[PDB]
Ligand binder design. Structure first.
Ligand SMILES: *[C@@H]1O[C@H](CO)[C@@H](O[C@@H]2O[C@H](CO)[C@@H](O[C@@H]3O[C@H](CO)[C@@H](O)[C@H](O)[C@@H]3O)[C@H](O)[C@H]2NC(C)=O)[C@H](O)[C@H]1NC(C)=O
Ligand SMILES: *[C@@H]1O[C@H](CO)[C@@H](O[C@@H]2O[C@H](CO)[C@@H](O[C@@H]3O[C@H](CO)[C@@H](O)[C@H](O)[C@@H]3O)[C@H](O)[C@H]2NC(C)=O)[C@H](O)[C@H]1NC(C)=O
Ligand SMILES: *[C@@H]1O[C@H](CO)[C@@H](O[C@@H]2O[C@H](CO)[C@@H](O)[C@H](O)[C@H]2NC(C)=O)[C@H](O)[C@H]1NC(C)=O
Ligand SMILES: *[C@@H]1O[C@H](CO)[C@@H](O[C@@H]2O[C@H](CO)[C@@H](O)[C@H](O)[C@H]2NC(C)=O)[C@H](O)[C@H]1NC(C)=O
Ligand SMILES: *[C@@H]1O[C@H](CO)[C@@H](O)[C@H](O)[C@H]1NC(C)=O
Ligand SMILES: *[C@@H]1O[C@H](CO)[C@@H](O)[C@H](O)[C@H]1NC(C)=O
Ligand SMILES: *[C@@H]1O[C@H](CO)[C@@H](O)[C@H](O)[C@H]1NC(C)=O
Ligand SMILES: *[C@@H]1O[C@H](CO)[C@@H](O)[C@H](O)[C@H]1NC(C)=O
Ligand SMILES: *[C@@H]1O[C@H](CO)[C@@H](O)[C@H](O)[C@H]1NC(C)=O
Ligand SMILES: *[C@@H]1O[C@H](CO)[C@@H](O)[C@H](O)[C@H]1NC(C)=O
Lengths: 283, 298, 164, 298, 164, 283
């Protein structure tokens, strides 16, 4: 019959300045059919002679956008087609992330909207110098802008492949990603500040690992603490050992802000975002 | 060809000991001039050796015996009194004297940041002899490279290999000279407990906020923080004070890059200085940082 | 084990030195792309769970990789070209720390009475660089491969302590 | 195998000049990725080179032209934009810049007693390039050994051959660096006129006789008296005076080892100092001797 | 002649250096008796009036003797034994001044267009000393013979000026 | 006949503790002769039987010193002999000197006097390693204690040979002498001191060569001057160029002593003795 459609079953698409070839959907290829412009009785023609299964338009300009009707010579409506004009997709914008050392996930956005139906094919491979060829990245709920890779090699390098395709062409975004470079843990949770009786200028801060980071002897986290008294403009920075740090220069009688961030214990990736500030006041 | 020789060739002996030198004449030389041991006279450094100290052993050889040797350098010459009115040289030797090396004591080492391990020791009594010093260090599974002291610094050596923390190393010094060989006691230690960090740099004082009587000290710690945990000593005094005060060590007992000093008088100028060393007190204190000045708010 | 504790502390030290010099190098001589060398090992093929594996293979595997890296680091210094003299004396200090750690690894196996692996056949000589810049490009591949090996080394040694 | 290279390998150019760099891609590399010169982007030290400075010559090569070069060190990298969403390095080079060496001026030499001939010169404008300095000296019938300056003292050299008086020697300094070679003017002189003797030693004042107001100065002249005739300058002042006086040179215009100073006040303390140089004034004055004190008779 | 004046001044300088080192040596290492060596020249055979002789023989004769002495002085330094290191650096300075003066003598003959003597056959190597003290004894013979040669050299050169 | 005598024609000599053999001077060897002690009629005997040409005394002690008479059996006085006892000569003491560069001369003294007639044989040779063998040193006036060698080699070494012989034995003194070592010139002559008008503390000293030193371009002399004001204890030393030296530190109004000495210009031998002092006084 004719090239099967992209989206809905009886609509075809085209680009300005091109040649566009409409087909009559519910008509056997080879049956002669007639074409009309909506509201206009003229039998339309196209570059290959005058009576086919498909109308063609070399014009392709904006006035040519609208609804077209094809019918067989008996009078039976063989179908309707709508010509919507547009442009091929632009290169999409792709980012990846990883909050743990095992799995990571990537997301993508169009860099330009065409007004045409759009969808994404995602895949990835491991560059070398076990089928390490192209492996699909399945999009977990529905067809969201996110795929997850489980059990990735931590030190190996992956070439992530997001390819945008529309009814008029394709454009592929490729993003190199290594688990050891992209990793960024979540901030610690439960930051609490307590007074230290007997010491008017000490506070004890304590906290735990983030829940997204399972405590394991293999991947610790190092920590970086910053603290600042209310109304003060400048942060003070310490590099605490362990999950606690006694501040010894707290200004007496003043609320103090304290925040902490996390990073892989072997300085892989980058420091987390700062935790929500927690406040305390020395005794 | 020569008439004879003196034996031993060039001896070195210990002070207050005895030395016997024997000069022997070849038969051919004795025959031409018609002489023997009885014609030998000994002279040294323009001083005639008294005939009474000689001992004629064979018709070919005469000998002398020195007691309680006290000269650091003796030039010995053996001569014969030809046809009773001339003297010709048979042989000569140089006698050097001194003392054996003393056992090196108070051996200690130090690892200055950016430099290789350096060890120091107390040398003992002067020996008057050319003495070479070689610093020895070796693992149980590897014999390490010798460290040869420099002419300028004969009591110190600086190894040519980079410092390796967290591994016990066996070190000792070997003193040896012509009169004797001896080794110092062996020491064993982890280089991590002998570090001498550089002093803090990038010292900043910062002015006071909307509250006065408070100053926050900031600085950049030395790169060595990646291997050891730092401890500090912060000293401060008023611009006019004569002595320095000090923050209680317990409050500055762990790595940090800032500290806010309190209870200072308003609109008063303060001078600060800081030093650091390994948190456990095992090692050496760094030098004092650059001086810093600051002013309290109004 | 006290002996295992000491060896792990020294490995973390060497990893930090390698990361700093590799990052310093890219700041002065930027690299565009992931560089590889056929003569370097490409044994760093595994995921997270790889901790699962047993002790003899890990120690044997670590020993083989590090000996190749030592040859390559020493090769870089004597013949890498005047362009890389700026990476001294830090590069020479890095070389010296690595030879001793290999010795420490052989001692660990001896003290624990572990079977020693058979002496593998040493790799042929690395060809000299084809240009001064080729040596610089080779350095990026070597340092990246080294610090990855060391990163996985720290993790593996810590896992064994968790079992025996 | 690599995709291409940049030529010239590692150029050095003069400040404010122009430099054109050409990057050429191998056919094989262009074929696999389906690219050509138009895909080359140039970046240096984290700064993107603006596309407008590029010039695509062949389908295999792109080129850029720098004008009024002002950076001392340029790291140049050639890159290709593969399949429009990645970038891989083709080649790289390091560009060094600077200035040619200036003509050495004010060349002068000095022969310090006990040391080998030493020459000094004024270096000119900084060149920012590694510059070697070699001191040249040669006779009409012999080319002499080069003198290579020391890292610490790049503007001075001390030859390794002993000084030979009474023979004219041709000396000059040769300055050369990657951007140019130049020689200083040649000088010609007899080492005998460039001697810097040591200062007098063994200074003695001697007390006064049965006549007062007279002091005789004695000292030991330097060994150098065997080659040149010495001249002296004797200065003296009262223990309380602020400035030194001086004996008329004509009275001390020839070699001597003593001098009696007259017309000094009785029972007064006097301080003396002396210096010497070649009698004809051709050479350099020695340093001042050790100070000497004396007292007149009663 | 200005050229002859310059050469005579340098000869007096070398004579003084040789006398001082020879006298210094006997103070530290006394000598008992007049020492001789078969390999040293014994050409210093003449009385006072010998000034009478002509110029070609004197210059040829001076050149041959000094070349032998140069060989012997250099031989003493490299192999005389550690006993004589105390005679440095003065002995090495003495050696250097003598080679150049020989060169100056060849130049004098060239500038005056004098027939050059035929290249005589160089003397075979001196055997090494049989002992350290044998080298010291050899030094007394060499220095005494040298300073005598130089003493007669100063006198002879001054006589030629008196005629031409 | 009998061993011919040493000194006078009819006296013989002997050593204590030896055997001494007197001969009758004017008697044919083989004629029997008789011997008497002066004032004593006893016919003397000796170890070889009793009637010879020669009396022998093995006694030889001091009582045996005196006059002996020998006569033939006819009564004719065949001669008289005197036995004087003594000892062989001691080694003589020899010194040499030279005040010029051409000739030198040596002198000798007995180290011990025997009381017996004595004479000296002198000779010398040139050690090598033209008959350079032993050459006699002729004693110029009479048989004085001095010989002269003319046209000696300046640089060669000579072994001087003084051999003492007496009627009972010999002893040879050998003295090595080289002209370059022994030379010592005479002091300069005619030292004069003059005032220097206009300069109250300068004096000009002038002098000439000594007459024993012929001025010649081949052997100059260097000079060493010492000067000292009257009543001063310490000499001042200068090394003048040439035959003149202007002193510039003369004490005003005081007589000054000046003396000079000479040495070979190439520092051969030793400095001369000091000239007689000459005095002058600054203007
Ligand atoms: C990144 O991933 C995307 C998606 O997998 C890749 O697009 C893929 O491109 C290849 C060409 O290399 C397509 O192969 C096909 O071959 C057939 C037979 O010749 C032809 O009919 C197609 O037109 C196409 O050329 C493949 O279909 C296409 N993937 C999808 C889902 O359409 C892209 O190549 C990847 N880039 C990498 C891994 O560097
Ligand atoms: C130093 O000079 C004196 C005097 O010339 C030397 O005394 C001389 O000694 C030689 C022996 O070497 C005497 O030779 C004679 O030989 C004959 C024949 O055998 C014999 O009858 C003599 O009794 C003696 O041995 C020589 O006569 C004698 N000179 C004189 C004037 O009596 C002495 O040897 C010389 N020493 C040297 C040059 O070292
Ligand atoms: C005379 O004494 C010398 C000195 O002891 C003897 O030479 C020694 O001989 C022994 C063996 O015969 C050697 O072990 C020594 O080394 C020799 N001494 C020296 C200094 O070389 C010599 O043999 C003796 N001669 C006679 C005839 O008794
Ligand atoms: C494209 O341009 C390059 C650069 O000039 C050409 O390569 C040069 O070729 C000449 C001789 O053919 C050599 O002397 C130069 O040394 C080459 N340049 C370099 C940088 O090596 C190349 O031939 C050109 N190709 C075409 C097809 O025109
Ligand atoms: C990684 O994926 C596995 C596979 O289901 C999962 O069990 C694990 O929880 C994931 N990791 C994290 C940190 O959620
Ligand atoms: C010789 O040596 C012995 C032992 O070393 C010592 O007792 C003695 O005093 C020395 N001197 C002599 C024996 O003159
Ligand atoms: C040490 O002893 C050796 C002995 O061979 C000697 O050569 C050397 O000069 C001495 N000193 C040094 C610094 O080596
Ligand atoms: C290129 O070089 C020429 C001559 O060296 C100079 O005049 C010009 O300014 C430079 N720059 C250009 C043409 O952009
Ligand atoms: C001088 O230039 C040479 C070029 O080969 C270089 O190797 C050397 O390091 C430079 N400096 C010195 C002091 O030789
Ligand atoms: C040396 O002897 C010769 C020979 O007669 C004599 O002419 C000359 O005057 C002497 N020398 C001196 C300085 O008297």
């Amino acid at each position: 019959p004719c090239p099967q459609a992209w989206g809905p079953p009886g609509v075809q698409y085209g680009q300005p300045g091109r040649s566009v070839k409409l087909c009559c959907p519910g008509v056997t290829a080879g049956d002669p059919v007639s074409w009309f412009r909506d509201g206009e009785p003229k039998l339309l023609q196209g570059p290959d002679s005058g009576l086919g299964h498909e109308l063609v338009l070399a014009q392709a300009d904006s006035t040519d956008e609208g609804t077209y009707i094809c019918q067989t010579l008996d009078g039976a409506l063989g179908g309707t087609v709508t010509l919507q004009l547009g442009y091929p997709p632009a290169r999409p914008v792709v980012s990846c992330q990883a909050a743990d050392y095992e799995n990571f996930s990537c997301t993508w956005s169009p860099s330009q909207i065409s007004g045409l139906p759009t969808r994404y094919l995602t895949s990835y491979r491991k560059k070398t110098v076990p089928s390490t060829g192209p492996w699909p990245c399945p999009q977990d709920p529905l067809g969201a802008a996110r795929c997850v890779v489980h059990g990735a090699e931590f030190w190996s390098q992956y070439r992530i492949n997001v390819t945008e395709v529309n009814p008029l062409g394709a454009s592929t975004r490729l993003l190199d990603v290594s688990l050891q470079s992209i990793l960024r843990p979540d901030p610690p949770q439960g930051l609490r500040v307590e007074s230290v009786p007997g010491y008017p200028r000490r506070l004890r801060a304590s906290w735990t690992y983030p829940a997204s980071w399972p405590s394991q002897p293999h991947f610790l986290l190092k920590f970086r603490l910053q603290y600042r008294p209310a109304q003060h403009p400048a942060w003070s920075t310490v590099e605490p050992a362990g999950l606690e740090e006694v501040i010894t220069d707290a200004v007496a009688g003043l609320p103090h802000a304290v925040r902490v961030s996390a990073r892989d214990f072997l300085d892989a990736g980058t420091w987390s975002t700062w935790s929500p500030e927690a406040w305390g006041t020395p005794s | 060809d020569p008439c004879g020789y003196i034996s031993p060739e060039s001896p070195v002996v210990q002070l207050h000991s005895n030395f016997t030198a024997v000069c022997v004449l070849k038969e051919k030389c004795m025959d031409y001039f018609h002489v023997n041991a009885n014609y030998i006279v000994w002279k040294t450094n323009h001083f005639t050796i008294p005939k009474e100290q000689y001992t004629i052993i064979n018709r070919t050889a005469s000998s002398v015996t020195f007691t309680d040797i006290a000269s650091l350098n003796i030039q010995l010459t053996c001569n014969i009194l030809t046809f009773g009115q001339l003297e010709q040289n048979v042989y000569g030797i140089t006698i050097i004297s001194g003392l054996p090396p003393e056992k090196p004591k108070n051996l200690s080492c130090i690892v200055n940041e950016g430099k290789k391990m350096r060890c120091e020791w107390d040398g003992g009594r002067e020996t008057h002899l050319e003495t070479n010093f070689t610093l020895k260090s070796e693992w149980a599974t590897h014999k390490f490279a010798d460290c040869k002291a420099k002419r300028d610094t004969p009591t110190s050596c600086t190894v040519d290999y980079s410092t390796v923390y967290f591994v016990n190393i066996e070190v000792w010094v070997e003193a040896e000279n012509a009169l004797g060989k001896v080794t110092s006691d062996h020491i064993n230690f982890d280089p991590v407990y002998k570090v001498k960090p550089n002093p803090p740099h990038n010292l900043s004082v910062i002015n006071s906020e909307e509250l006065s009587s408070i100053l926050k000290l900031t600085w950049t710690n030395p790169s060595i923080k990646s291997v050891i945990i730092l401890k500090y000593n912060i000293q401060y005094r008023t611009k006019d004070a004569s002595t320095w005060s000090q923050i209680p060590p317990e409050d500055t007992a762990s790595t940090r890059s800032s500290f806010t000093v309190q209870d200072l008088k308003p609109f008063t100028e303060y001078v600060f200085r800081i030093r650091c060393m390994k948190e456990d007190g095992k090692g050496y204190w760094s030098d004092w940082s650059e001086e810093a000045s600051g002013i309290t708010y109004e | 084990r006290a002996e295992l504790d000491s060896t792990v502390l020294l490995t973390r030290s060497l990893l930090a030195d390698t990361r700093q010099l590799a990052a310093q190098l890219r700041d002065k001589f930027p690299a565009d792309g992931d560089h590889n060398l056929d003569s370097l090992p490409t044994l760093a093929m595994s995921a997270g769970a790889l901790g699962a594996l047993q002790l003899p293979g890990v120690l044997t595997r670590l020993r083989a990789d590090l000996l190749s890296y030592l040859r390559h680091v020493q090769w870089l210094r004597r013949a890498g070209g005047s362009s890389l003299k700026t990476l001294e004396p830090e590069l020479g200090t890095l070389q010296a720390r690595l030879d001793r750690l290999l010795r420490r690894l052989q001692l660990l196996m001896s003290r624990l009475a572990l079977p020693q692996p058979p002496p593998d056949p040493p790799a042929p000589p690395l060809a000299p660089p084809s240009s001064a810049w080729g040596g610089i490009r080779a350095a990026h591949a070597i340092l990246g491969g080294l610090h990855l090996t060391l990163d996985w080394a720290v993790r593996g040694l810590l896992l064994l302590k968790t079992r025996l």
